[PDB]
Design an enzyme around this catalytic site. Structure first.
Site, short mmCIF file in Angstrom:
data_model
loop_
_atom_site.label_atom_id
_atom_site.label_comp_id
_atom_site.label_asym_id
_atom_site.label_seq_id
_atom_site.Cartn_x
_atom_site.Cartn_y
_atom_site.Cartn_z
N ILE A 263 0.35 -40.15 5.54
CA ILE A 263 1.70 -40.07 4.63
C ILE A 263 2.52 -39.15 5.29
O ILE A 263 3.52 -39.20 5.52
CB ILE A 263 1.35 -39.88 3.22
CG1 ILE A 263 0.25 -41.32 2.75
CG2 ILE A 263 2.28 -39.76 2.30
CD1 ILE A 263 0.94 -42.33 2.99
N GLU B 70 -0.08 -28.91 8.39
CA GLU B 70 -1.41 -29.32 8.04
C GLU B 70 -2.41 -28.24 8.57
O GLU B 70 -2.17 -27.28 9.06
CB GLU B 70 -1.71 -30.35 9.47
CG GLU B 70 -3.21 -30.67 9.46
CD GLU B 70 -3.77 -31.10 8.20
OE1 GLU B 70 -3.05 -32.25 7.49
OE2 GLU B 70 -4.75 -31.09 7.71
N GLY C 129 -8.74 -49.19 8.48
CA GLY C 129 -7.74 -49.32 9.31
C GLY C 129 -7.05 -51.05 9.14
O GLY C 129 -6.44 -51.43 9.93
N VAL C 130 -7.24 -51.34 7.90
CA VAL C 130 -6.87 -52.95 7.68
C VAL C 130 -5.38 -52.70 7.08
O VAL C 130 -5.21 -52.03 6.04
CB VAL C 130 -7.70 -53.45 6.73
CG1 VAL C 130 -7.22 -54.70 6.42
CG2 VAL C 130 -9.14 -53.62 7.32
N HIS D 24 -3.60 -54.59 4.82
CA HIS D 24 -4.00 -55.65 4.06
C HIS D 24 -2.81 -56.74 3.44
O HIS D 24 -1.72 -56.25 3.33
CB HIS D 24 -4.29 -55.23 2.66
CG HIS D 24 -5.64 -54.48 2.64
ND1 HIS D 24 -6.87 -54.93 2.64
CD2 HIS D 24 -6.02 -53.09 2.81
CE1 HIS D 24 -7.94 -54.16 2.71
NE2 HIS D 24 -7.30 -53.16 2.78
N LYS E 202 -13.20 -52.38 -3.74
CA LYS E 202 -12.48 -52.66 -2.57
C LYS E 202 -12.88 -52.41 -1.29
O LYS E 202 -13.65 -51.39 -1.32
CB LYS E 202 -11.06 -51.91 -2.97
CG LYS E 202 -10.21 -52.41 -3.94
CD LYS E 202 -9.39 -51.40 -4.74
CE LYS E 202 -9.06 -51.94 -6.28
NZ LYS E 202 -8.45 -53.29 -6.11
N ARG F 45 -11.44 -42.11 -1.33
CA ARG F 45 -9.93 -42.38 -2.05
C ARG F 45 -9.84 -41.44 -2.92
O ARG F 45 -10.61 -41.14 -3.72
CB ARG F 45 -10.32 -43.49 -2.60
CG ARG F 45 -10.55 -44.79 -1.68
CD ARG F 45 -11.08 -46.13 -2.58
NE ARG F 45 -10.75 -47.30 -1.96
CZ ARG F 45 -11.59 -47.91 -0.90
NH1 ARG F 45 -12.66 -47.24 -0.63
NH2 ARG F 45 -11.18 -48.92 -0.10
N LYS G 216 -4.84 -43.90 -2.73
CA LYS G 216 -6.02 -44.60 -2.43
C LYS G 216 -5.87 -45.93 -1.74
O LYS G 216 -4.58 -45.95 -1.17
CB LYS G 216 -6.55 -45.14 -3.84
CG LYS G 216 -5.62 -46.06 -4.67
CD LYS G 216 -5.97 -46.18 -6.17
CE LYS G 216 -6.13 -47.63 -6.76
NZ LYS G 216 -7.16 -48.41 -5.81
N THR H 41 -1.68 -49.54 4.42
CA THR H 41 -0.74 -50.42 4.55
C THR H 41 0.71 -50.01 3.78
O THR H 41 1.72 -50.68 4.63
CB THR H 41 -1.44 -51.73 3.69
OG1 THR H 41 -2.73 -52.02 4.27
CG2 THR H 41 -0.64 -53.10 3.89
C1 LIG Z 1 -13.18 -45.61 2.82
C2 LIG Z 1 -11.66 -45.84 2.66
C3 LIG Z 1 -11.13 -47.09 3.21
C4 LIG Z 1 -9.74 -47.43 3.00
N1 LIG Z 1 -9.26 -48.54 3.92
C5 LIG Z 1 -8.03 -48.78 3.92
C6 LIG Z 1 -7.56 -49.73 4.60
O1 LIG Z 1 -8.26 -50.61 5.23
N2 LIG Z 1 -6.26 -50.08 4.41
C7 LIG Z 1 -5.58 -49.23 3.84
O2 LIG Z 1 -4.30 -49.93 3.41
N3 LIG Z 1 -5.98 -48.23 2.88
C8 LIG Z 1 -7.13 -47.85 3.15
N4 LIG Z 1 -7.57 -46.58 2.55
C9 LIG Z 1 -6.48 -45.92 2.09
C10 LIG Z 1 -6.12 -44.79 3.07
O3 LIG Z 1 -6.94 -44.38 3.91
C11 LIG Z 1 -5.35 -43.80 2.49
O4 LIG Z 1 -4.55 -44.24 1.64
C12 LIG Z 1 -4.61 -42.56 3.36
O5 LIG Z 1 -5.21 -42.40 4.51
C13 LIG Z 1 -3.94 -41.39 2.67
O6 LIG Z 1 -3.49 -40.74 3.60
P1 LIG Z 1 -2.90 -39.33 3.29
O7 LIG Z 1 -1.79 -38.79 4.23
O8 LIG Z 1 -2.31 -39.19 1.98
O9 LIG Z 1 -4.36 -38.06 2.92
P2 LIG Z 1 -5.01 -37.51 3.96
O10 LIG Z 1 -5.14 -38.57 5.15
O11 LIG Z 1 -6.23 -37.05 3.31
O12 LIG Z 1 -4.19 -36.49 4.69
C14 LIG Z 1 -3.78 -35.34 3.67
C15 LIG Z 1 -3.54 -34.16 4.54
O13 LIG Z 1 -3.08 -33.00 3.84
C16 LIG Z 1 -4.03 -31.92 4.41
N5 LIG Z 1 -3.93 -30.70 3.26
C17 LIG Z 1 -4.60 -30.71 2.15
N6 LIG Z 1 -4.33 -29.57 1.55
C18 LIG Z 1 -3.56 -28.58 2.31
C19 LIG Z 1 -2.87 -27.36 2.29
N7 LIG Z 1 -2.85 -26.78 1.03
N8 LIG Z 1 -2.03 -27.15 3.36
C20 LIG Z 1 -1.80 -27.76 4.20
N9 LIG Z 1 -2.57 -29.05 4.28
C21 LIG Z 1 -3.41 -29.52 3.23
C22 LIG Z 1 -5.53 -32.43 4.62
O14 LIG Z 1 -6.13 -31.44 5.71
C23 LIG Z 1 -4.92 -33.68 5.15
O15 LIG Z 1 -5.17 -34.09 6.50
C24 LIG Z 1 -8.98 -46.26 2.62
C25 LIG Z 1 -9.41 -45.19 1.98
C26 LIG Z 1 -10.68 -45.04 2.11
C27 LIG Z 1 -11.19 -43.60 1.61
#
Ligand SMILES: Cc1cc2nc3c(=O)[nH]c(=O)nc-3n(C[C@H](O)[C@H](O)[C@H](O)COP(=O)(O)OP(=O)(O)OC[C@H]3O[C@@H](n4cnc5c(N)ncnc54)[C@H](O)[C@@H]3O)c2cc1C
Ligand code: NI
Length: 384
Positions: free
Chosen positions: A14, A33, A48-49, A51, A258, A320, A347, A352
């Site tokens: 994100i 980060e 990695g899907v 959807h 899911k 999630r 989540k 996707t």
């Molecule tokens: C098991 C599983 C299966 C999934 N499968 C799918 C799928 O097939 N398809 C789909 O569309 N979605 C899927 N998802 C959803 C998807 O993986 C997540 O929606 C997405 O990775 C979330 O990304 P993010 O950037 O919000 O969070 P993250 O990848 O958790 O990144 C957040 C970042 O903030 C950093 N951070 C936290 N606090 C601080 C701080 N105070 N200061 C600086 N940095 C900080 C962390 O180190 C971090 O890397 C899946 C999720 C899970 C758990």
């Protein structure tokens, strides 16, 4: 102390896609980060899907952003950004009559989420086993949906960031936000790694901190939403002989959670999982355990009985982040601070949905923005 327009906190997918989108404007942007490398957390530990939209409740933001998000990946991001991915259809399988009527429900959901009829096909026992001869013969029915893809979410997140970085976005790793204070004059001061004095002064914060997206809002005194967790462990298996799959096979999500799958991976191995455990600590969201392998054996073999799970290469886990209040995505300004944008409760299917999620982030800054005329957005991540 850097003065900047936008601080993006979190370098998962994100945060990275946000940096990419903002890099097309005339703005001083920085992404922070806490880890030494990007995409080490939830965006590392997922399947990695991309959807289709068959799954999410059509009345929720999960469905809404799934729909927009996927179009953006296929018709905009894939044309510009090079990273591993492949087109691979979705197959959901039913084991009895109750699971069979769940397929009919899922079909309707897909149509409500705007999947064209030509992409959806209900299959009999016989037709399903013709398509995928290695599936459990005790299944009674299947639902096939064309249009899904599988990507490497890590390589994709990094590609996005490198692309952003090439267009003047500052990426600061090993930089953990430890305090935030909004000023009398409207800007924020931001302290990192518990240093004494602030490292940043910024006009807007985009909160993309995954399992700490809630923590970070509480820290800025901006919103008081809370997340819970669901931790899932996977195994990757190899050397399965004659075994082939030309689909990602899913249990009925309605009954089994899911994204419970057996899928052929980009590297030629098979992904199996995940398990599900609610309420683990934030700091434990990626811990693997010795309990999970046994559940994983039952899940894989129920779906693909000829699977040999002893031929295991790795175990990994992710969780999630789930908004407690709505069980939905959070994509809005903080209720108590219009200058702090929240991308939380990311989540499934946040991967996707990402591209649409982050375009909305850019709009929620509520600025007249000026494009750089010389941006095209292209980056080919070297990989082999
Ligand atoms: C098991 C599983 C299966 C999934 N499968 C799918 C799928 O097939 N398809 C789909 O569309 N979605 C899927 N998802 C959803 C998807 O993986 C997540 O929606 C997405 O990775 C979330 O990304 P993010 O950037 O919000 O969070 P993250 O990848 O958790 O990144 C957040 C970042 O903030 C950093 N951070 C936290 N606090 C601080 C701080 N105070 N200061 C600086 N940095 C900080 C962390 O180190 C971090 O890397 C899946 C999720 C899970 C758990
Ligand atoms: Ni409806």
């Amino acid at each position: 102390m850097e003065t900047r327009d936008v601080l993006i906190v979190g370098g998962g997918v994100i945060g990275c896609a946000t940096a990419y989108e903002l890099s097309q404007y005339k703005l001083k942007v920085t992404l922070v980060e806490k880890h030494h490398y990007l995409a080490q957390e939830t965006s590392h530990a997922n399947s990695g899907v991309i959807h289709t939209g068959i799954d999410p409740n059509p009345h929720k933001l999960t469905a809404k952003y799934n729909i927009l998000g996927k179009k953006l990946w296929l018709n905009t991001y894939f044309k510009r950004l090079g990273f591993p991915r492949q087109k691979i259809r979705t197959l959901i399988v039913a084991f009895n009559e109750m699971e069979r009527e769940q397929l009919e429900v899922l079909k309707q959901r897909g149509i409500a989420n705007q999947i064209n009829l030509e992409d959806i096909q209900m299959l009999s026992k016989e037709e399903t086993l013709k398509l995928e001869p290695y599936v459990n013969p005790e299944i009674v029915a299947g639902l096939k949906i064309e249009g899904s893809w599988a990507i490497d979410p890590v390589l994709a997140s990094k590609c996005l960031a490198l692309a952003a970085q090439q267009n003047k976005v500052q990426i600061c790793t090993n930089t953990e936000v430890t305090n935030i204070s909004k000023q009398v004059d409207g800007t924020y001061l931001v302290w990192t790694n518990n240093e004494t004095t602030p490292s940043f002064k910024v006009k807007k914060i985009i909160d993309a901190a995954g399992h700490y997206a809630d923590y970070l809002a509480h820290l800025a005194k901006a919103d008081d939403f809370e997340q819970t967790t669901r931790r899932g462990q996977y195994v990757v298996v190899t050397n399965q002989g004659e075994l082939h799959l030309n689909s990602m096979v899913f249990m009925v999500p309605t009954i089994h959670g899911k994204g419970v799958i057996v899928s052929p991976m980009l590297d030629g191995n098979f992904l199996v999982g995940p398990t599900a455990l609610d309420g683990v600590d934030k700091e434990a969201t990626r811990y693997i355990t010795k309990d999970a392998p046994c559940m994983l054996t039952k899940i894989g073999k129920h779906m693909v009985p000829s699977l040999n799970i002893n031929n295991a290469l790795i175990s990994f886990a992710g969780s999630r982040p789930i908004d407690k209040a709505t069980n939905d995505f959070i994509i809005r300004v903080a209720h108590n601070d219009p200058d702090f944008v929240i991308l939380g409760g990311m989540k499934s299917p946040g991967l996707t949905a990402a591209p649409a999620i982050v375009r909305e982030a850019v709009r929620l800054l509520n600025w007249k923005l000026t494009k750089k005329p010389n941006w095209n957005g292209k980056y080919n991540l070297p990989w082999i």
